[PDB]
Amino acid sequence: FTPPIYQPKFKTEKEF
Amino acid sequence: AAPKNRRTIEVNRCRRRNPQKLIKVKNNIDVCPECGHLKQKHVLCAYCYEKVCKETAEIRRQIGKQEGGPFKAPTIETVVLYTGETPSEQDQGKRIIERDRKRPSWFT
Amino acid sequence: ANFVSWKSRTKYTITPVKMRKSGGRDHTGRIRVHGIGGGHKQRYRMIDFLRFRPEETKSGPFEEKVIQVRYDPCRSADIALVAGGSRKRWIIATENMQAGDTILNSNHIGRMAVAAREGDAHPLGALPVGTLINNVESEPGRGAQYIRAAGTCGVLLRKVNGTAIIQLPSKRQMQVLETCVATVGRVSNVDHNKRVIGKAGRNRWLGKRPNSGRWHRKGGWAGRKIRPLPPMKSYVKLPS
Amino acid sequence: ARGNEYQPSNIKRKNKHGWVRRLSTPAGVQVILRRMLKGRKSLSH
RNA sequence: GCUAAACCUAGCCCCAAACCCCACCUUACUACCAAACCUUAGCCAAACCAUUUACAUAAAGUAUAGGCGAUAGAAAUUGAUGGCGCAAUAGAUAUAGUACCGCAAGGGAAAGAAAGCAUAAUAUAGCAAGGACUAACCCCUAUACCUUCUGCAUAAUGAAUUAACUAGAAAUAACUUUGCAAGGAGAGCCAAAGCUAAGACCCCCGAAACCAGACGAGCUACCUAAGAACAGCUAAAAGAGCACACCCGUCUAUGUAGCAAAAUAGUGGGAAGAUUUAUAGGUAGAGGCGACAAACCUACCGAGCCUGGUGAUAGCUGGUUGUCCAAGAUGAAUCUUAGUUCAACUUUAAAUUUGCCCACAGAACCCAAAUCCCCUU
RNA sequence: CCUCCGCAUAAGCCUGCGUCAGCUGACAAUUAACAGCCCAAUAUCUACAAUCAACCAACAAGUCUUAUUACCCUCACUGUCAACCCAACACAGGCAUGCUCAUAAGGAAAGGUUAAAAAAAGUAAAAGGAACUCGGCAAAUCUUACCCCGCCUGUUUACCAAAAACAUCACCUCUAGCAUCACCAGUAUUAGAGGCACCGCCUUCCUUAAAUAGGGAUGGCUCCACGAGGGUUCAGCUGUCUCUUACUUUUAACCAGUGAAAUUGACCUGCCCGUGAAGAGGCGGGCAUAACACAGCAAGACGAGAAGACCCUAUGGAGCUUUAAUUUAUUAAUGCAAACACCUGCAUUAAAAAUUUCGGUUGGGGCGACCUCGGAGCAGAACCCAACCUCCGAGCAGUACAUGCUAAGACUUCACCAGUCAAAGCGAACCUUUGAUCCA
Ligand SMILES: [Mg+2]
Ligand SMILES: [Mg+2]
Ligand SMILES: [Mg+2]
Ligand SMILES: [Mg+2]
Ligand SMILES: [Mg+2]
Ligand SMILES: [Mg+2]
Ligand SMILES: [Mg+2]
Ligand SMILES: [Mg+2]
Ligand SMILES: [Mg+2]
Ligand SMILES: [Mg+2]
Ligand SMILES: [Mg+2]
Ligand SMILES: [Mg+2]
Ligand SMILES: [Mg+2]
Ligand SMILES: [Mg+2]
Ligand SMILES: [Mg+2]
Ligand SMILES: [Mg+2]
Ligand SMILES: [Mg+2]
Ligand SMILES: [Mg+2]
Ligand SMILES: [Mg+2]
Ligand SMILES: [Mg+2]
Ligand SMILES: [Mg+2]
Ligand SMILES: [Mg+2]
Ligand SMILES: [Mg+2]
Ligand SMILES: [Mg+2]
Ligand SMILES: [Mg+2]
Ligand SMILES: [Mg+2]
Ligand SMILES: [Mg+2]
Ligand SMILES: [Mg+2]
Ligand SMILES: [Mg+2]
Ligand SMILES: [Mg+2]
Ligand SMILES: [Mg+2]
Ligand SMILES: [Mg+2]
Ligand SMILES: [Mg+2]
Ligand SMILES: [Mg+2]
Ligand SMILES: [Mg+2]
Ligand SMILES: [Mg+2]
Ligand SMILES: [Mg+2]
Ligand SMILES: [Mg+2]
Ligand SMILES: [Zn+2]
């Protein structure tokens, strides 16, 4: 088993 | 199963610009001779129906004020009367819902 | 670890003392003894193993009344609350000790052998040779340390000079100055052997737990093996 | 089944990673010193 | 015409110089009760590994040391403010040690001023082009690229695509061009044409690991302290029966980027005990804990995690970016056959003089094709 | 219409559906009696459970302070919200306690439509009733009997194994004669460790129609009970099956909103035969061939997922065991010195460990063979030529003791290392194979 890797939250929380 | 190759824009256009996918032109649209509004042949005129719904809502608010509580449906007919109207002979023995506006032209 | 032994009480008392279980752990918090843990909560009754302890501002042989004989969670042998003068103390009850009995504790080494009555404590020099004894001291006034388990009885094998030879319940001889005190008879609860635990749960109540990995050395338990000498290496394990 | 290994309790948090425990040993003091050198806003937990 | 594209200073790099109110160690930021010092190891090199290696100038890589081998290695003596830097994927990680991730140690950002589509889907046939043609297609020709292989369209590897970034660092000795020349060199060094100076030449990513020091027992294993829960019926003081709560996880189906990094539904085991469970505390990494399953120790435990040594090492895989021309192809030893050293081959430059082909003559007794050798040519 | 739901406390979180105006900002809010935050000391005290505590029943034996001396001032401080916490999420999971036992509390399975396949869940089913199948799995329904294993209740591979494995009372063996940190405030009827397994007694036929199934003719036995254990069976039951069908829900498909992931060299992406790095959409020869959606299928794209599984290699790791090699630094014993029990140094023996290694070529049904040198054939005639190839031989001896010293020129096992031959000369006389360096 290989653990999942989470991408940094800032990338997907951006707003205009 | 996963795609074996990226689908090209040319193929994608052939697919998603097919007539089966294009929006069809509607040919049942016409003008309501009453008010001149657009309507579909088989459907009610939206504007006229909005008129009727608003008037119905007002009449129903009056009915609710008159009834005053749930489970008070009358066992007698109802008649809506506008300003300057009097219960007729056949309107006798029917609950009168009084409206403060004048009789609409389309209401008879 | 922040382990401080519960055995901090300094003054003797009759009241059972709240004793903290160890789980077989050191003060470091690591397991030192395996198979220990859980069990019924127990209270410790301080046992006075120095049977000849004359009261304060008092001396010489003294008698004591057996207030009661009680079960002790912390021992195989049952104990006796026994009172003398104006004090009470817990002692190890002998086989036939009953409530209301009288017990004699003396330090007098009579020229003749004192009539050995079960339960009383005399210096070993005062006992007839061959009497059954328990709660034996190693040194005069040290306090009983040997022959303390239920039903155990040493034998006063010999008396010569100021030295007595005792047979411990392990059938090993021991030399003790005849001035050291011992109590006559075998310890109480003689049927402790015949008790049948019956189920694993009862041992778990008694605080014994099933524990593995009891050795912590590389490879675990390893029985001793005779290392062959060079001449015998040829025949250590002859193939069939 | 897994994932919820953190069962928060402020008592354990402070007793395990607090300022007092960090200062209780030279190793913890060096932990604090490293955080200070790095410029951490939160030196201890 | 959309998305976008672009920009220049915010700062940074390398040098020089100069030596730089109140609260808070208790659960930190809480007004106020009776004790420090102690060899680093290991990776790595030795093609394993075990001693060993691996934490001004000149004398000199000399004396010395060394499985006398890899390699290590003196001293006597001598005396000595700037930028052919970066300019927002660069330069500091930095707008910030912030956000965010982690229980913790710890990790640690981003950013400010073409591609893809749409205008405008599509026409028999085919690496999508080329030769063409009046003409887009129709005709004819044409088995993507890279890498790895004896040999790849290969149904071997890699690549959706665009932008940006991303990989040959240096000595010994040569050669070339200067200077001076039996001397050269700005002490030391070399010298039987040498010496002095310059020019040219030696990559990138990747393990599982090992050791040091921290951090972790809010999960889980076990334990300590003091708590709590266990209906109803049957039975009578039960590791008792049936069966709720509760705990578990037998079997089946579903789910399989899922509701879920282990769940759901049904079914099932225990359910007053060796039970389950809240709270706080303890045991720490060759260690703990373990009713031994190599089980568990913060989702990935035959030995945790983080930081450091560390740009570990890799005879192994992958990658290695302008144009053009030229020469260029199949034994020995080796813990060695996935490698290397020598040879052979190969390339360049230089010297001077025979080189290949080659008939006649010539090359063995024992018991065939040809070959070797060389006057001529 | 639905709910082991709901309300509180704890824990956790920390303003996270209150108002207002434009998710953002502003404004507001939880008020102590509940809860937390305590105690002036010295000593001396404190045997007698609990279980309605009264009988009864025990064993596992069970939270249990006054005197004296000081001292009078008084209700401060803090928590109080929520639709909430741990799981990256408005996550079907995790989540203690008190009460409500179906709710007085809390909620909404259907965005609209249609009524396809496949798929999920459920209901019903003629006749039959295990013929299904590895197996009665699942479902439906009641049951019988018997074997194997383990005595039993328990524990275990969190996330493929719950078991016959582990533990377990019982029993056996070994070790220990003793106190102030475990064992243990214990003492041989004790403690520690290991083994074993409760306990107790002695030393071809049947089954079927058909039967690779099942049952029976210290050791040897005895299975009381138990078991989601593993087998077999009677009877029943059933859509397991003969042999499938119907309906409902979900999914589905269409409409509206929002909107991923693996994947992807480019593709203008056909069939047959042949060929080819040996399996062709793409090459050769034929055949076919307007262009596009939508829904299905899973034969191919050696289809997509982890530089898969398995096998081999690496002078790559790591683990384990040892009569592998090297050590005993450290402990434990001794001995010798050294200080007059304790301690230092030096030896020896152990324990415990520590570090390190796993040569090569050959051999599928073995129980190894080989590794250097030389002779013969392969390799016929200069030289040279392999093999797990076909055969043979050697690790020196005999001799003498010029079998000395020197030295032109040569050969050379395809490199080097090494190995050969040798005129002349000097000096006596008058020969025919194994191995380097360092180190000693
Ligand atoms: Mg917990
Ligand atoms: Mg090495
Ligand atoms: Mg010097
Ligand atoms: Mg930057
Ligand atoms: Mg463009
Ligand atoms: Mg390919
Ligand atoms: Mg490959
Ligand atoms: Mg690819
Ligand atoms: Mg815990
Ligand atoms: Mg009950
Ligand atoms: Mg029970
Ligand atoms: Mg366990
Ligand atoms: Mg095992
Ligand atoms: Mg195993
Ligand atoms: Mg982990
Ligand atoms: Mg590398
Ligand atoms: Mg050429
Ligand atoms: Mg060798
Ligand atoms: Mg190699
Ligand atoms: Mg709904
Ligand atoms: Mg719908
Ligand atoms: Mg039927
Ligand atoms: Mg059958
Ligand atoms: Mg049947
Ligand atoms: Mg069949
Ligand atoms: Mg079943
Ligand atoms: Mg069992
Ligand atoms: Mg499992
Ligand atoms: Mg479990
Ligand atoms: Mg299972
Ligand atoms: Mg059968
Ligand atoms: Mg069971
Ligand atoms: Mg839609
Ligand atoms: Mg073919
Ligand atoms: Mg293809
Ligand atoms: Mg289709
Ligand atoms: Mg591979
Ligand atoms: Mg040669
Ligand atoms: Zn109208």
Numbering used by the authors:
A (entry chain d): 41 to 56
B (entry chain 0): 79 to 186
C (entry chain D): 61 to 300
D (entry chain 2): 48 to 92
Article excerpt on this structure:
The human mitochondrial ribosome (mitoribosome) synthesizes 13 essential subunits of the oxidative phosphorylation (OXPHOS) system. In human mitochondria, the GTPases GTPBP5, GTPBP6, GTPBP7, and GTPBP10 mediate mtLSU maturation, as their deletion results in a loss of active mitoribosomes and stalls mtLSU biogenesis at distinct states.
Thus, two distinct mtLSU biogenesis intermediates accumulate in the absence of GTPBP6, one containing MTERF4-NSUN4 and one additionally containing GTPBP5. The structure of the second mtLSU intermediate reveals the structure and function of the Obg domain of GTPBP5. GTPBP5 binds above the PTC and interacts primarily with the rRNA. The Obg domain extends along the PTC and contains three conserved loops at its tips (loop 1: residues 93–103, loop 2: residues 140–145, loop 3: residues 191–205)18. In the GTPBP5-containing intermediate, the PTC adopts a more mature-like conformation in which the PTC loop forms the base of h89, and the h80 tip is shifted upward. Second, GTPBP5 stabilizes the refolded PTC conformation through backbone and base interactions with charged residues in loop 1 and loop 3 (R97, K98, E95, E99, and R201). The cryo-EM reconstructions show density consistent with 2’-O-methylation at all these residues, suggesting that GTPBP6 acts downstream of MRM1-3 and GTPBP5, in agreement with previous data.
